[PDB]
């Protein structure tokens, strides 16, 4: 039931966000699907009571269809995190706000998935592109129409860590995860980390996860995979 | 008939339960609960396995062993008393057909592995796998697909018996629609699911499904795909709390097809999770209220935490007739009628809109209130596919003949008092059975007269009033809500005459009773109120902090204990970890009231709460006590000498 | 699915070495769970006469339970212990109890060393609503202007109890770096169960040490880590002068009972609103009032009382360490050089110099209560020169 077919779906994206907002400090850049989706995203948010604690916890950075006003909150977000404010930015995956940044542990260290990040928009640009790869490999309808979402997902999502201690809370609010998210996530990244024993993680339960995550991960850092001389190890 | 799953086993094999001589399987335990504790840890301690009755919980050096199993071992236990860091008893019942993510032999291994081969009597053995795990999915083709199990070795008996009884058998706009049907996978492994025998044969089948040695789990696949309509649900900012967040997570840890029955303590989020089940599930639901008393309440928080109200409201008892034509989500009441044209078109609508309800949901408050004769009409009238048992009571009516999992399936969740009363919003009651030294000029008469005026004698006591007068001003000083429950009116009336307070009785006008609620539950100037037998039962759920009781004569332990369990709310935003809800009872010494309280405090320690008997006050003549002269009490006494039996009877 | 999967968590952890000896190694791992960070000290340089500033976040974060029924209950209760154990270790100092509540800052108890005043303040701080949001800028404003009038011969450190929330304050607190970096005031925060990067940048731009609260035991650790007067930044001071040595007075010296009470609004001293009979005497005011080993308000110098406070750190620096061996050199008759016993949990504790054999209960009693090896005595003082 699509981004405008029911708002009963949308009754708890705020709930899964505000608690993400309540727990996670230090700036978050999340990814919507499109601009009218984004316009649909905040559509119930004003008139029905949503922001009533969301603006009270952090603040919000709307990204505009026009790139001029889109670059504005940006000027704010690099600043509004580095002062006494968390100031979660709100953005669109497929929109061109998702490149050229390389978020640092300074600002931007968490990403929330919102929906299957596929195209959903342009009609019949599919079918000839579809049938030609069906003229190339013939079972591809199911196949790349997963990965096109996936190739944009961690393109967007897997951004906020630069070095290798920079943190990242890349949670997955998604209904399509069973094979698709697993196929699309890196083989280094499905293996040790993705769903070790955490799949159907209700947010209220998943609250304490990031709590357990960060609190431990914030302290005791000195030594993390220190290499000196050459000692084979052979991977 | 045809209503017999495995009843609770132990009935025999034991003689003078002081088994100082035999304890033979306990000697297997007592070998290793005693051979093991040598070097500073026990590595033993079999939960004190007792063959008959029940077994215990160690829970005094649980560390990790039995403190993990402070919860987890309790699946088929129920932990009926609660304690301090000591032992903890339980009972045993039907609760393996709830524990169906595990084998009865798998627990039996850990039943041994907890017990350090503290071996069963066998009594549990001959009652372990009496009902093999088996589900009943209701899949997309309008009735059911004949699901068996993850495990295959059960159709081998079944298909060699059941069919010889009764057989079984644009592009992008639609691309994702089969991607959902792509997600219709193997049902965790192999499913082994068969085809509907024509929808009118399952009733004929269910009675024979249990007939060998299996038992069936009715489900509710109403969320992914559903062929009939879906109402407009909308959860308008209804922030809730992790006691009931766990609840639906127990109702849904699997996919979108499993029914549920969850126990809460009293005053908990009762009208929340069902309203949460009203909206999340996307069904067209039904409530079955106990009385119209319930019906007004349960829609009201539904009117609160759901904006589903645009004459979209279906309350159906005591000439309510609200939205018959068009049923979306309804509240009903248990049509206990069986009468000759009781409600001509009205109960016909209750019959016929049950048929329009299809299945909906069976929201059922507190079915300990339901008799087994009405449990006939539970299944006979209502033939739904998903139920909801909202029953704080675990065991009721002393009826160990008919159990309840045959009615409602598994009994999913019960919430711990400790993790609500110590870690949670539920306040801590101080229960007080307070007895008083009476004046003896109530009692020589009492023992002279073996006639029910004797009941009214200790009742109309200023020694009771001196306690009654006391805690009013003693808790006026904390400026917090207090409520007193008497037994009958005309004694209580003089309390509302002498130290005159807000009060009600039987025939009082409800619109002014509501003003009294407005004068009580809103106005902070008067935190004092009197109630009668009706107000707890038929008009109001009071919402207070401190309760005083006078009535203790009838043996309905819980029915009285659920009155206090509903009313007593949090007193203040108290920083301290103390008790803040308060119960008081007024007990006549040397009386039926003295005798009843002994069994009553026995029932108090049967569940176990913060309880204290006080007898003296915190300085009696500190307050200007009325009836300080016994001549004034003699003035009351001659009213009692003028009194009849009519002041001494309740609503029944 | 999950009804099995809820109990796939339980089943293995319940299970262990079976047959015989069950639920045994599960207890061994619990002992193997123990033995966390010991000391890791050994420092020099600075730490003397601190001037601490309790800063308390009063916010809606307190309403979460997370360790206690309130996060203040986690906080406030052990602060009294932290007060007392401070005044135990460091009496040469004083502490500014300043409370942030509703986006302002209330200096609740002044910078002082009187424990009862500080503790009853915490006992007054029990029934705090903690309404409103944290504002550190108001807290640093008090912290500046108060410590601005303190000498540069003062240790300048700030202890902030922050509930990890949004640092809700304007007015360029990022520019308060150069304010306070120049002002040579140290600022130390520890985060309540989370982290604030700006505050983490603040402390790393400070030299104050930042941490995150893990647990109630862990909460105590960092308190205990900040009990000790830390080696703050170089070029603070060297000296601090006119340390007034007082006199006790018995008021029975020559003229027996010539004064009914030694506080009658004219006597040199008699500072606080209460009657007294003469117990004390300062050099410079010649101030006679209720005894106090701190300082005064008229002579305005430091009422030093040497056996108390010129003794406390006076052995808190010069420590050495022991070593541990599991071996059996059986020194004594399988005894201890201290308490004289034996259990042999392979922790034969040998001194670095005098090399004497001790137990945990002799090592702890040194390293928490005695703070030195007395085996060095009989061994230092006999050839000492
Ligand atoms: Zn002076
Ligand atoms: Zn020793
Ligand atoms: Zn030594």
Q: Which residue of B has its CA nearest to C70?
A: B575
Mapping DSSP to helix (H, G, I), strand (E, B) and coil, where does residue A182 land? helix
C-alpha–C-alpha distance, residues A91 and B216, integer Å? 49
Token pair of A160 as six digits: 């906020």
| DSSP 8-state secondary structure symbol assigned to residue B646 | G
Q: Which of B368, B372, B417, B359 is nearest to B389 (CA)?
A: B368
The owner of tokens 């609250």 is A207
At B338, is the secondary structure helix, strand, or coil? Answer: coil
Q: What is the CA radius of gyration of chain A?
A: 19
What residues contact C241, with CB distance under 8 A and at least 6 apart? none
B566 labelled as ligand-binding? yes
Q: Please tell me what DSSP assigns to residue C68.
A: B
Q: How many CA atoms lie within 13 A of C39 on its CB side?
A: 14
With beta carbons under 8 A apart, name residues in chain C contacting B254.
Answer: 1-3
Q: Is the dihedral of CA B450, B452, B456, B459 positive or negative?
A: positive
B569 is in an annotated binding site: yes
* Residue B541, token pair as written in the block: 């759920």
Cα gap A85→B442, rounded to integer Å: 73
CB atoms within 10 A of CB B309: 11
Is B166 among the annotated ligand-binding positions? no
- Which residues have C-beta within 8 Å of that of residue A43, sequence separation ≥ 6? none
Of B172, B185, B236, the CB nearest to A48: B236
Domain residue ranges in chain A: 1-218
CA C360 to ligand 2 center in whole angstroms: 6
Task: Give the Cα separation of C225 and C218 in Å (integer).
Answer: 10
For C136, nearest residue in chain A (alpha carbons): A84
CA angle (B578, B583, B585) in 5-degree steps: 145
Contact: A219, C211; criterion CB under 8 Å: yes
Q: Do B249 and A145 touch (CB under 8 A)?
A: no
Please enumerate in sequence order all residues whose Cβ is within 8 A of that of C32, keeping only pairs 6 or more positions apart, or say none.
none
**Least Cα separation, residue A24 to chain B (angstroms):** 19
Q: Is the dihedral of CA B214, B220, B221, B224 positive or negative?
A: negative
User: B436, exposed or middle or buried, with CB in 10 Å at 0-12, 13-18, 19+?
Assistant: buried
* A contact set with B (CB within 8 A): 7-8, 11-12, 15, 48-50, 120, 123, 126-127, 130, 141-142, 145, 176, 178, 200, 202, 204-205
Q: How far apart are CA B599 and CA B593, in angstroms?
A: 10
Tokens of B645: 């039996």
Contact between residue B140 and residue B227 where contact means Cβ atoms under 8 Å apart: yes
Among chain B residues, the shortest Cα distance to A13 is held by: B237
Contacting residues of C for A195, CB less than 8 Å apart: none
Q: To 5 degrees, how large is the angle CA B378–CA B382–CA B383?
A: 115
Interface contact B113-C18, CB threshold 8 A: yes
Strands, E assignment, B420-513: 429-431, 433-436, 482-485
One-letter-per-residue 3-state SS of B99-155: CCCCCHHHHHHHHHHHHCCCCCCCCCHHHCCCCECCEECCCCCCCCCECCCCCCCCH
Tokens 């449990």 identify what position? B375
Of C1, C4, C22, the CB nearest to B102: C4
Distance CA B242, CA B249 (A): 10
CB distance B68 to B57 below 8 Å? no
Q: Kindly report the three-state secondary structure assignment for every residue of B1-51.
A: CCCCCCCCCCCCCCCCCCCCCCCHHHHHHHHHHHHCCCCCCCCCCCCCCCC
User: Can you tell me the distance from the alpha carbon of B24 to that of C370, in angstroms, rounded to the nearest whole number?
Assistant: 57
What is the distance in angstroms between the Cα of A98 and the nearest Cα belonging to chain B? 25
- B72 neighbourhood in chain C, CB within 8 Å: 7, 10, 14
Looking at chain A, how many residues does it have? 235
Give the whole-angstrom CA distance, residue A186 versus residue A161: 15
CB atoms within 10 A of CB B647: 21
Neighbours of chain C (3+ CB pairs under 8 A): A, B
Vertex C115, ends C111 and C119: CA angle to 5°? 95
Question: Shortest CA distance to B551 belongs to which of B415, B471, B459, B461?
Answer: B459
Distance C352 CA to ligand 3 centre (A): 8
B88 labeled part of a ligand binding site = no
State how far the Cα of C264 lies from the Cα of C276, in Å rounded to an integer: 9
State which residue of chain A sits closest to B239, comparing Cα positions.
Answer: A15
Binding partners of A (≥3 Cβ pairs within 8 A): B, C
Chain C positions contacting chain A at CB under 8 Å are: 2, 9, 136, 164, 166-169, 173-174, 191, 193-198, 201, 211-214
Q: How far is it, in rounded angstroms, from Cα C188 to Cα C206? A: 8
- As a whole number of Å, the CA-based R_g of chain B is 28
Are A47 and A105 in contact, with CB atoms under 8 Å apart? no
> Cα(B339)–Cα(C316) distance, rounded to whole angstroms?
91
Q: Say whether C166 and A57 touch across the interface (CB within 8 A).
A: yes
Residue A106 has its nearest CB partner, among C194, C196, C197, at: C197
- CB of C77 within 8 Å of any CB in chain B? no
Closest residue on chain A to B224 (Cα):
A1
Interface test with A, best of B237, B258, B276, B283 (most A CBs within 10 A): B237
* Residues 6+ away with beta carbon under 8 Å from B618: B470, B474
Over C321-336, what HEC string results?
Answer: CEEEECCCCCHHHHCC
Tell me if residue C28 falls in helix, strand or coil. Answer: helix
What's B576's DSSP letter? S
Q: What distances in angstroms separate CA B524 from CA B527, B568, B570, one per listed residue?
A: 6, 17, 16
3-state secondary structure of B549: strand
Question: Which residues of B fall within a CB distance of 8 Å from C130?
Answer: none
Interface membership of C27 toward B (CB under 8 Å) = yes
Q: Nearest C-alpha of chain C: how many angstroms from A182? A: 19
Q: Which two tokens stand for residue B548?
A: 């005083």
CA distance B226 to B282: 9
Ligand 3 mean position, distance from CA C312 (Å): 20
Chains that touch B (3 or more CB pairs under 8 A): A, C
Residue of A nearest to C176 (CA): A83
Beta carbons within 8 Å of C236's beta carbon, 6+ residues apart? C46, C152, C153, C155, C156, C184
CA torsion angle B388 B357 B308 B267 (round to 10): -20
CA distance C91 to C304: 10
Q: DSSP string of B165-230?
A: TS----HHHHHHHHHHHHT---TTTT---B---TTTSHHHHHHHHTTSSB--EE----SS--SS--
Between the CA of C27 and the centroid of ligand 2 the distance, in Å, is: 26
- C322 CA: distance to closest CA in chain B (Å): 29
What number of other Cβ atoms are within 10 A of residue B204's Cβ?
11
* Cβ neighbours of A222 in C, within 8 Å: none
Pairwise CA distance, residues A38 & A31, whole Å: 9
Q: Binding residue per annotation — B338? A: no
Using a CB-CB cut-off of 8 Å, the residues of chain B touching C63 are none
Q: Alpha-carbon distance B548 to B432, whole Å?
A: 9
* Resolution of the PDB structure in angstroms: 4.4
Nearest to A109 by CA among A179, A35, A30: A30
- For C48, the token pair is 């003397």
Cα of C6 to nearest chain A Cα, Å: 11
Chain B interface includes C17 (CB < 8 A): no
CA distance B432 to B34: 41
> Within 13 A of C127's CA, how many CA atoms are on the CB side?
5
E-only strand ranges, chain C: 51-58, 94-101, 106-112, 157-162, 186-191, 211-212, 247-248, 280-281, 322-325, 348-351, 357-358
Cα(A94)–Cα(B390) distance, integer angstroms: 47
Which ligand approaches the C-alpha of residue C286 most closely? Answer: 1
Partners of residue A58 in chain C, C-beta under 8 Å: 166
Residue with token string 């809800």: B581
CA distance C100 to C106: 6
Chain A / chain B CB contacts < 8 angstroms: 39
Q: Hey, how many other C-beta atoms are within 10 angstroms of the C-beta on C29? A: 11
The answer to whether C26 touches B120, Cβ cutoff 8 Å, is: no
What span, in angstroms and rounded, lies between the C-alpha atoms of B82 and B88? Answer: 6
CA-wise closest residue to C4 among B111, B152, B412, B102: B102
Hey, what long-range contacts does B405-409 have (CB within 8 A, 24 or more apart)? B405/B5, B405/B94, B405/B97, B405/B98, B406/B3, B406/B4, B406/B5, B407/B367, B407/B375, B407/B378, B407/B379, B408/B259, B408/B261, B408/B362, B408/B364, B408/B367, B409/B97, B409/B217, B409/B218, B409/B259, B409/B261
Rounded CA separation B110/B128 (Å): 13
Distance in angstroms (rounded) separating the CA atoms of residues B404 and B406: 5
**Is beta strand C106-112 parallel, antiparallel or unpaired with respect to C94-101?**
antiparallel
Note every long-range contact of C44-48, with CB atoms under 8 Å and residues 24 or more positions apart, other chains counting: C44/C231, C44/C317, C45/C231, C45/C234, C46/C155, C46/C229, C46/C230, C46/C231, C46/C232, C46/C233, C46/C234, C46/C236, C47/C155, C47/C228, C47/C229, C47/C230, C47/C231, C47/C232, C47/C313, C48/C92, C48/C155, C48/C229, C48/C313
Query: Could you confirm whether domain A1-218 is CATH 3.40.140.10?
Result: no
- Establish how many alpha carbons lie within 13 A of residue C43's alpha carbon, considering only the half-sphere containing its beta carbon: 13
Taking alpha carbons only, the member of C351, C345, C359, C340 closest to residue C376 is C351
Strand, helix or coil at B444?
A: helix
Phi, psi (degrees; rounded to nearest 5) at A171 = -85, 165
Extract the tokens encoding C344: 């042999």
Distance from CA of B36 to the nearest CA of C (A): 7
Residue B169 assigned to a binding site: no
Task: Measure Cα distances from B232 to A5, A8, A41 in Å.
Answer: 12, 8, 19
Cβ–Cβ gap B179/A176 under 8 Å? yes
CA–CA separation, B565 vs B560, rounded Å?
9
CA proximity to A8, closest of B524, B173, B230 = B230
> Which chain C residue lies closest to A105 (C-alpha atoms)?
C197
- Closest by CA to C226, choosing from C11, C33, C2, C41, is C41
Q: Classify C235 as helix, strand or coil.
A: coil
Each as own residue / partner, the long-range contacts of residues B36-45 (CB below 8 Å, 24 or more positions apart, any chain) are B36/B116, B36/C21, B36/C22, B36/C24, B41/C23, B41/C24, B41/C27, B42/C23, B43/B116, B43/C21, B43/C22, B43/C23, B43/C24, B43/C27, B44/B116, B44/C23, B45/B116
Write the CB contacts of B266 (distance below 8 Å, at least 6 apart in sequence).
B392, B562, B565, B566
Mutation to test the B interface, candidates A11, A54, A178, most B Cβ within 10 Å: A11
Q: Do residues A108 and A29 make contact, with C-beta atoms less than 8 angstroms apart?
A: yes
Residues B459/B461/B466/B469 CA torsion (nearest 10 deg): 50
**Sign of the torsion angle spanned by Cα atoms C251, C257, C263, C265:** negative
Tokens linked to A36: 């009218």
Residue B233 has a CB neighbour count (10 Å cut-off) of: 22
Is B480 buried (19+), middle (13-18) or exposed (0-12) by CB count in 10 A? middle
Specify the DSSP element, H or E, that contains B514.
Answer: helix B510-517
Q: Quote the tokens at residue C62.
A: 């307190």
Instruction: Give the dihedral sign, CA B519/B522/B528/B534.
Output: positive
Contact status, residue A44 vs residue A10, Cβ threshold 8 Å? yes
């Amino acid at each position: 039931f699509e981004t405008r077919e029911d708002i009963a779906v949308i009754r708890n994206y705020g709930n899964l966000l505000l608690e993400m907002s309540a727990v996670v400090p230090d700036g978050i850049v999340a990814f919507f699907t499109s601009y009218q989706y984004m316009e649909s995203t905040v559509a119930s948010w004003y008139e029905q009571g949503i922001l009533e604690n969301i603006q009270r916890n952090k603040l919000l950075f709307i990204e505009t269809q026009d790139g001029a006003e889109t670059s504005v909150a940006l000027e704010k977000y690099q600043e509004a995190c580095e002062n006494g404010r968390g100031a979660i930015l709100l953005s669109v995956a497929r929109g061109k706000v998702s490149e050229g940044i390389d978020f640092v542990h300074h600002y931007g260290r968490a990403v929330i998935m919102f929906g299957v990040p596929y195209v959903y928009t342009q009609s019949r640009i599919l079918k000839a592109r579809l049938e030609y790869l069906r003229d190339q490999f013939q079972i591809r309808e199911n196949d790349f129409l997963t990965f096109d979402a996936m190739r944009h997902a961690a393109q967007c999502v897997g951004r906020a860590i630069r070095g290798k201690t920079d943190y990242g809370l890349m949670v997955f609010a998604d209904k399509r995860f069973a094979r698709g998210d697993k196929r699309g996530k890196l083989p280094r990244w499905i293996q040790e980390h993705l769903t070790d024993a955490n799949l159907n993680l209700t947010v209220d339960e998943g609250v304490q996860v990031a709590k357990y995550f960060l609190r431990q991960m914030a302290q005791p850092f000195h030594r993390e995979d220190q290499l000196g001389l050459s000692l084979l190890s052979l991977e | 008939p045809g209503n017999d799953p495995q009843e609770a086993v132990p009935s025999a094999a034991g003689k003078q339960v002081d088994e100082s001589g035999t304890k033979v399987d306990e000697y297997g335990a007592k070998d290793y609960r005693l051979q093991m504790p040598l070097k500073d840890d026990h590595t033993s301690r079999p939960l004190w396995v007792a063959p008959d009755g029940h077994i215990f919980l160690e829970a005094f050096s649980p560390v990790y062993k039995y403190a993990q199993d402070f919860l987890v071992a309790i699946a088929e236990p129920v932990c009926r008393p609660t304690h301090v860091h000591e032992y903890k008893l339980t009972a045993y019942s039907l609760y393996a057909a709830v524990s169906v993510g595990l084998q009865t032999s798998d627990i039996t291994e850990y039943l041994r592995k907890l017990s350090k081969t503290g071996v069963p009597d066998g009594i549990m053995q001959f009652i372990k796998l009496c009902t093999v795990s088996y589900g009943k999915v209701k899949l997309v083709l309008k009735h059911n697909r004949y699901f068996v199990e993850s495990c295959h070795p059960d159709v081998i008996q079944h298909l060699l018996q059941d069919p010889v009884i009764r057989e079984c058998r644009m592009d992008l706009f639609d691309f994702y629609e089969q991607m959902d049907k792509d997600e219709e996978e193997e049902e965790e492994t192999q499913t082994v699911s068969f085809e509907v025998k024509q929808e009118m044969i399952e009733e004929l089948q269910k009675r024979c499904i249990h007939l060998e040695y299996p038992l069936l789990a009715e489900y509710d696949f109403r969320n992914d795909s559903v062929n009939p309509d879906i109402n407009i649900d909308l959860k308008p900012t209804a922030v809730l709390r992790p006691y009931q967040e766990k609840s639906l997570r127990k109702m849904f840890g699997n996919g979108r097809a499993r029914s549920g029955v969850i126990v809460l303590p009293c005053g908990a989020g009762k009208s929340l999770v069902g309203v949460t089940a009203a909206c999340t599930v996307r069904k067209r639901c039904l409530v079955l209220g106990n009385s119209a008393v319930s019906v007004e309440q349960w829609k009201a928080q539904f009117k609160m935490w759901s904006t589903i109200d645009d004459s979209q409201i279906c309350r159906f008892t005591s000439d309510a007739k609200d939205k018959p034509i068009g049923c979306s989500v309804a509240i009903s009441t248990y049509s206990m009628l069986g009468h000759t044209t009781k409600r001509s078109w009205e109960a016909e609508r209750v019959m016929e809109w049950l048929k329009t309800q299809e299945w909906g949901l069976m929201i059922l408050d507190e079915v300990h209130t339901i008799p087994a004769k009405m449990f006939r009409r539970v299944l006979t009238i209502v033939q739904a596919h998903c139920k909801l048992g909202l029953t704080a009571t675990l065991v009721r009516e002393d009826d160990k003949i008919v159990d309840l999992n045959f009615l409602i399936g598994p009994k999913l969740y019960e919430a711990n008092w400790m993790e609500l009363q110590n870690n949670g919003y539920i306040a801590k009651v101080q229960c007080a059975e307070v007895w008083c030294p009476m004046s003896p000029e109530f009692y020589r008469e009492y023992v002279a007269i073996k006639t029910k005026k004797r009941i009214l004698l200790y009742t109309m006591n200023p020694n009771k009033f001196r306690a009654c007068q006391f805690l009013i001003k003693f808790h006026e000083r904390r400026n917090d809500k207090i409520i007193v429950f008497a037994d009958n009116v005309f004694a209580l009336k003089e309390y509302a005459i002498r130290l005159n307070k807000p009060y009600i009785y039987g025939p009082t006008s409800q619109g002014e009773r509501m003003q009294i609620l407005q004068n009580f539950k809103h106005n902070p100037k008067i935190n004092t109120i009197f109630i009668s037998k009706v107000g707890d039962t038929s008009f109001d759920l009071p919402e207070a902090n401190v309760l005083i009781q006078i009535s203790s004569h009838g043996g309905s332990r819980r029915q009285e204990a659920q009155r206090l369990g509903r009313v007593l709310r949090a007193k203040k935003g108290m920083v301290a970890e103390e008790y803040n809800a308060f119960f008081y009872s007024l007990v006549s010494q040397d009386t039926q009231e003295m005798a009843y309280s002994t069994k009553r405090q026995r029932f108090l320690v049967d569940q176990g709460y913060s309880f204290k008997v006080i007898t003296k006050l915190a300085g009696m003549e500190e307050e200007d006590l009325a009836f300080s002269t016994k001549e004034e009490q003699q003035q009351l006494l001659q009213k009692v000498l003028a009194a009849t039996d009519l002041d001494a009877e309740e609503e029944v | 699915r999950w009804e099995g999967g809820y109990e796939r968590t339980w089943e293995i952890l319940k299970e262990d070495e079976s047959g015989s000896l069950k639920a045994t190694i599960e207890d061994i791992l619990f002992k193997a769970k123990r033995k966390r960070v010991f000391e890791h000290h050994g420092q020099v340089r600075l730490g003397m006469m601190r001037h601490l500033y309790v800063v308390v976040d009063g916010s809606r974060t307190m309403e979460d339970q997370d360790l206690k029924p309130n996060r203040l209950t986690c906080t406030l209760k052990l602060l009294e212990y932290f007060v007392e154990e401070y005044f135990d270790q460091n009496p040469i100092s004083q502490i500014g109890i300043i409370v942030t509540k509703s986006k302002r800052a209330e200096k609740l108890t002044e910078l002082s060393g009187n424990p009862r005043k500080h503790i009853t303040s915490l006992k007054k701080a029990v029934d705090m609503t903690c309404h409103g949001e944290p504002s550190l800028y108001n807290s640093l404003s008090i912290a500046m202007q108060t410590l601005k009038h303190m000498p540069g011969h003062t240790s300048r450190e700030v202890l902030i109890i922050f509930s990890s929330l949004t640092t809700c304050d304007p007015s360029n607190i990022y520019d308060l770096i150069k304010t306070l970096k120049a002002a040579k005031i140290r600022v130390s925060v520890i985060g309540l169960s989370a982290e604030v990067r700006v505050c983490t940048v603040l402390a790393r731009e400070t030299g104050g040490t930042y941490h995150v609260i893990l647990d109630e035991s862990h909460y105590k650790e960092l308190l205990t880590h900040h009990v000790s007067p830390p080696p703050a930044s170089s070029s603070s001071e060297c000296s601090l002068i006119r340390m007034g040595f007082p006199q006790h007075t018995i008021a029975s010296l020559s003229d027996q009972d010539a004064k009914p009470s030694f506080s009658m609004a004219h006597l040199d001293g008699n500072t606080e609103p209460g009657l007294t009979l003469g117990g004390y005497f300062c050099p410079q005011c010649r101030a006679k009032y209720c005894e106090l080993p701190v300082e005064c308000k008229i002579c305005g110098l430091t009422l030093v009382s040497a056996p108390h406070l010129a003794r406390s750190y006076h052995h808190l620096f010069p420590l050495d360490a022991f070593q541990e061996i599991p071996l059996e050199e059986y020194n004594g008759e399988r005894f201890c050089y201290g308490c004289q016993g034996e259990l042999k949990d392979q922790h034969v504790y040998v001194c670095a110099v005098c090399q004497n054999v001790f137990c945990v209960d002799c090592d702890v009693f040194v390293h928490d209560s005695l703070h030195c090896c007395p085996g060095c005595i009989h061994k230092i003082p006999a050839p000492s020169g």
